[PDB]
Design a protein around this ligand. Structure first.
Ligand code: NA
Length: 134
């Protein structure tokens, strides 16, 4: 249950949950449609993860889940809202058969009108296992 990142002119990198824990941590507290109460997520900013593995922030990346659901994320949204690849919810790891080990989280509660809609909910890929340039 790792995170495969496809790199254009370099080998595909396989990141573990430990690899993300060793990167700069960001925490967001937010409500989301799948939660019973707001939760605090700990993760690495997608911008940080992409720059450290691609050496730049691409125009658009595709995130793919365990079940092959795929969603695209745009540079503008990465810059404006700074979503995180979460690896911890309320300080605990997320079970891999539920939404773990990785879940793309936007800080919905910090930008309610912009983010609380299906346009952004559909980008919050849980059981995240692959990233590639779109
Ligand atoms: Na969508």
């Amino acid at each position: 249950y790792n995170l495969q990142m496809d790199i254009p002119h370099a080998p595909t990198v396989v990141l573990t949950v430990q690899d993300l824990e060793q990167m700069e941590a960001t925490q967001y507290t937010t409500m989301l449609p799948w939660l019973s109460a707001p939760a605090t997520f700990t993760g690495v900013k997608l911008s940080t993860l992409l720059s450290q593995q691609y050496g730049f922030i691409p125009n658009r990346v595709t995130l793919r889940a365990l079940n092959d659901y795929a969603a695209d994320i745009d540079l503008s949204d990465i810059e404006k809202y700074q979503p995180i690849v979460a690896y911890r919810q309320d300080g605990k790891p997320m079970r891999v058969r539920d939404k773990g080990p990785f879940w793309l989280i936007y800080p919905q509660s910090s930008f309610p009108k912009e983010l609380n809609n299906e346009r952004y909910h559909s980008q919050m890929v849980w059981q995240l296992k692959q990233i590639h340039i779109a």
